[PDB]
Paper text:
TBEV belongs to the family Flaviviridae of positive-sense, single-stranded RNA viruses. Here, we report the structures of the native TBEV virion and its complex with the Fab fragments of the neutralizing antibody 19/1786. In contrast to the principles suggested by Caspar and Klug and unlike most isometric viruses, the three E-protein subunits within one icosahedral asymmetric unit form unique interactions with the surrounding glycoproteins. Both E-proteins and M-proteins are anchored in the virion membrane, each by two trans-membrane helices. Two M-proteins and two E-proteins form a heterotetramer in which each M-protein interacts with both E-proteins.
Residue numbers in the entry:
A (entry chain C): 1 to 492
B (entry chain H): 1 to 212
C (entry chain L): 1 to 208
D (entry chain B): 299 to 397
The structure:
């Protein structure tokens, strides 16, 4: 199970009638899809990449200067020129020196001067941006059922079916071994907003760095570093890593200004990253809307027996899995293959089954079976496996799990959650109305400010809130509420 | 084993109507497409109704455009051809086809094929005649046999020699069109010791009226 | 419509030799290439599409080429199971027109025929008719004469010719010969004799 | 129209010669390379988001046919949202960017 390999795990249940499960798979999430009467579906977005996308402006970090030529003239003796004033990749500045009679002018006062360089660069000091294409970006989704087997991350899982999604794919009928077919219908353009995604790239051959990054287009065109394109020889706006000074009648020294690996990446407050593996520019953040049709699935081992009630050598003991779910690993050395006698009874009523299973139809197999995850009600939970009970307790609370789902309603409804309101399945008067009343909110807030920063968020928030308090009109006294949204909401 | 069993081979007068079928097996239906191809008895092939997957639409050449109706069924595995207003030159070997996954125009697997003879006049049956020589010369290595299927209408034919015992050296003739009648023959080759000692009687089982 | 004329109508080959069949087109159809292989009584075989692809079940004995008007169906290692009829096809145009059919033949020498001319016995005299039956068998090539000797008299009445594919065992060709008379004309002439003159061998071989 | 006595094409032999992109006037243009049974009515259809039943492809080139020397350019206007433009089996994920 890949859903055990991370924290952000979310059980979208498959209710009766819900067969076309609309999801939003983030990049670095995992949604287990437990439908009552279907095999549970660990479905997760694996990778978002593109096989060498186009590039945008590259940016020299460490400049290089050579062929520096300086010329001056007397105040009224025809102000200075150079052949390198109008050569490619040359930064120049006209300025008034103070021509004395040391270099033997006719007069004193403001004589002109100019000096130029070749604004070159250093190798492997390029901040190469990349925009993704809407027609070549690949969304990879790997899906694993619950076979009762647990396979690690340094290993690879046998039935782990992988689905790639490009602009020319609609629906991926993934055969889940004997469980049947799952049908993923993912939609590419309703995912990562590719219009303003710059995959910035420095020297990847530097061992101790990340490989790709992820930044925004507006700031990218607000970069005042010298830039160029693919094959363009000379740097556009090269007067930014090259500056000048004041001479003393002869020589103004055009100073080399150096490197920018720190101002960019190291003193900068809250920007995400990405990845490169060879010739595919991966991402690490993401989200994509997929519809998941479980209609061709079935449970495996429905025509088997139950196992022994005694023989279950605990290769792995049951433990708490961070999400009010309990896993285990039974090793059964008797009559294989069989359905595992999994039950967890109620406390106060010792008959009543309350085992809200996650792995449906737990079955020991010929070379597999054993991993049995289940969700449990809070408090005392007696996990039998036949007559051999791993007697057990769970630390959750009743309203604590509900409030946990409210906390998931806090943290998942983040900037990702502005679009990801399809965590349910066509809610009607829950989802559509939410999309309306939040498209008008998220649209307005993405429109205004263009992003302003948390200190300006609280500055402008408290300022307009003071204008809420200091207001004569009771009708305009709702400025405390209008500023109140700016104070309370977007500070996480 | 992919099987395309043709059926509906009858004997109807011109301006008539047939309904072909094709029992399909070994392949799923709507992932592929099905069509009909005819073959004239003088070895000149001709398309009847080529059509795409899923029963979207129907093509006909201008020879048969607007008269026939090709239809289908998915789960039952049957390709239909509702024909009507038969031309007299519609006597041709109708073949059930199987186009590829790519719908390549050509058809990878096929069927055994039937014959729908569109003949004007009413049918007539032949008789059995295992004939014998009269005035005659010396022995040879082999002296072949003789039987005639005459005065019948119309094809096809099933003729063998002594219920399939003597089949060494067969020479089968399909048909010769002569004055709205056909006449074929067949051969089998034995030495001059076999004929007078053993007995040979030819089999005329011609399915015009299906009699002997 | 775009016609597909085969240049090889009736061609022959040996077992171990590699031969090919070409096919014309009225205009440039490019990679709309299609061929077949049908035996008499059995099914065709859609071997090659777009002049370079195969279906699972077609061996490396069947290659192909030809993109444009002229196509190419080259067959190496001509087996006994290649004695069949090869069709041509374009699938560019509607309708997807066809070739007439290339009858690939097996190479064999020039042989002499044989005739067992059989007059009617007492089983046909009941019906009032008498149909004298001839046979021309065991001959290559297909060019052979079909005539009648009713007391040596020339008679074009009773010349009905049908062709036959090359035999899998004997490798021969056949041309039919059948006469249709009455009982009176059966009882007016004594000696009955059929004539079979091969292209090379100019001798009628008879049971006189 | 031209191509009313023809049929719907193959579903398979359509390949993108050309990438479906927005016109700058809310239409999607393309060009296919159909190397099969020519000429024929191209199965152009484009579903929406929220209902995969209904085709909503408001066409601009009606009745597209891949002629013996011609055909390919197809243009269509679409409502906003996710849109899967089918050209036979060949499809294309598209979001109409206009409101
Ligand atoms: C996975 O890691 C564990 C722990 O170090 C190790 O015992 C096991 O052999 C590893 N498997 C592979 C395939 O590297």
């Amino acid at each position: 199970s890949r859903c055990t390999h991370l924290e952000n795990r979310d059980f979208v249940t498959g209710t009766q009638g819900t067969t076309r499960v609309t999801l939003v798979l983030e990049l670095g999430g995992c949604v287990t899809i437990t439908a009552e009467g279907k095999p549970s579906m660990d479905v997760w977005l694996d990778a978002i990449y593109q096989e060498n996308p186009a590039q945008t402006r590259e940016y020299c970090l460490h400049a290089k200067l050579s062929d520096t030529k300086v010329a001056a003239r007397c105040p009224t003796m025809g102000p200075a020129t150079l052949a390198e004033e109008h050569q490619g990749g040359t930064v120049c500045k006209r300025d008034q020196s103070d021509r004395g009679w040391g270099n033997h002018c006719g007069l004193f006062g403001k004589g002109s001067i100019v000096a130029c360089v070749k604004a070159a660069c250093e190798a492997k000091k390029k901040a190469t941006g990349h925009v993704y294409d809407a027609n070549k970006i690949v969304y990879t989704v790997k899906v694993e059922p619950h076979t009762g087997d647990y396979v690690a991350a340094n290993e690879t899982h046998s039935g782990r079916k992988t689905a790639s999604f490009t602009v020319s794919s609609e629906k991926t009928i993934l055969t889940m071994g004997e469980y049947g077919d799952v049908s993923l219908l993912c939609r590419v353009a309703s995912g990562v907003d590719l219009a303003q995604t710059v995959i910035l790239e420095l020297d990847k051959t530097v061992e101790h760095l990340p490989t790709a990054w992820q930044v925004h287009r507006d700031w990218f065109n607000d970069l005042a570093l010298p830039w160029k394109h693919e094959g363009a020889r000379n740097w556009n706006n090269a007067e930014r890593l090259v500056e000048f000074g004041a001479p003393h009648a002869v020589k103004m020294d055009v100073y080399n200004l150096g490197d920018q690996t720190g101002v960019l990446l190291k003193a900068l407050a809250g920007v995400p990253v990405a990845h490169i593996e060879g010739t595919k520019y991966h991402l690490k953040s993401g989200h994509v809307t997929c519809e998941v049709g479980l209609e061709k699935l079935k449970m495996k081992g429905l025509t088997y027996t139950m196992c022994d009630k005694t023989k279950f050598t605990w290769k792995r003991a049951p433990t708490d899995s961070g999400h009010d779910t309990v896993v285990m690993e039974v090793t059964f050395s008797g009559t294989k293959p069989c359905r595992i006698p999994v039950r967890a009874v109620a406390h106060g009523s010792p008959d009543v089954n309350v085992a809200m299973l996650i792995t449906p139809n737990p079955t020991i197999e010929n070379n597999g079976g054993g991993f049995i995850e289940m969700q449990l009600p809070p408090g005392d939970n007696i996990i039998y496996v036949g007559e051999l009970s791993y007697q057990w307790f769970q630390k959750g609370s009743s309203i604590g799990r509900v409030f946990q789902k409210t906390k998931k309603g806090i943290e998942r409804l983040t900037v990702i959650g502005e679009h990801a309101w399809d965590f349910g399945s066509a809610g009607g008067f829950l989802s559509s109305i939410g999309k309306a009343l939040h498209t008008v909110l998220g649209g307005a807030f993405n429109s205004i400010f263009g992003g302003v920063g948390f200190l300006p968020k609280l500055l402008l928030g408290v300022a307009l809130a003071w204008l809420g308090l200091n207001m004569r009109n009771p009708t305009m006294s709702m400025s405390f509420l209008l500023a109140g949204v700016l104070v309370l909401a977007m500070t996480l | 084993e992919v099987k395309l069993e043709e059926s509906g081979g009858g004997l109807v007068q011109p301006g008539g109507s047939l309904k072909l079928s094709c029992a399909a097996s070994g392949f799923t239906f709507s992932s592929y497409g099905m069509s009909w191809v005819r073959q004239t008895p003088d070895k000149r092939l001709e398309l009847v109704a080529a059509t795409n997957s899923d029963g979207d639409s129907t093509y006909y050449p201008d020879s048969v455009k607007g008269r026939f109706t090709i239809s289908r069924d998915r789960a039952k595995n049957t390709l239909y051809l509702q024909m009507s207003s038969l031309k007299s030159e519609d006597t041709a070997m109708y073949y059930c086809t199987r186009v590829l996954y790519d719908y390549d125009g050509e058809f990878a697997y096929w069927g055994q094929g039937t014959l729908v003879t569109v003949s004007a006049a009413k049918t007539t049956p032949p008789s059995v005649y295992p004939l014998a020589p009269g005035s005659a010369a010396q022995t040879n290595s082999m002296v072949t046999l003789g039987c005639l299927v005459k005065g019948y209408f119309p094809e096809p034919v099933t003729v063998t020699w002594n219920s399939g015992s003597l089949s060494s050296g067969v020479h089968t003739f399909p048909a010769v069109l002569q004055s709205d009648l056909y006449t074929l023959s067949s051969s089998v080759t034995v030495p001059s010791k076999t004929w007078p000692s053993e007995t040979v009687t030819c089999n005329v089982a011609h399915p015009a009226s299906s009699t002997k | 419509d775009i016609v597909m004329t085969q240049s090889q109508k009736f061609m022959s080959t040996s077992v171990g030799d590699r031969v090919t069949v070409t096919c014309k087109a009225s205009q440039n159809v490019g990679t709309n290439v299609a061929w077949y292989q049908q035996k008499p009584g059995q099914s065709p075989k859609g071997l090659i599409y777009s002049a370079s692809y195969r279906y699972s079940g077609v061996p490396d004995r069947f290659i192909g080429s030809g993109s444009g008007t002229d196509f190419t169906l080259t067959i190496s290692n001509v087996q006994s199971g290649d004695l069949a009829e090869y069709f041509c096809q374009q699938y560019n145009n509607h309708p997807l027109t066809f070739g007439a059919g290339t009858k690939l033949e097996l190479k064999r020498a020039d042989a002499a025929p044989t005739v067992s001319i059989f007059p009617p016995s007492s089983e046909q005299l009941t019906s009032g008719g008498a149909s004298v039956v001839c046979f021309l068998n065991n001959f290559y090539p297909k060019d052979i004469n079909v005539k009648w000797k009713i007391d040596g008299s020339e008679r074009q009445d009773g010349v009905l010719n049908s062709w036959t594919d090359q035999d899998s065992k004997d490798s021969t060709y056949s041309m039919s010969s059948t006469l249709t008379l009455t009982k009176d004309e059966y009882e007016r002439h004594n000696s009955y004799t059929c004539e079979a003159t091969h292209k090379t061998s100019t001798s009628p071989i008879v049971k006189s």
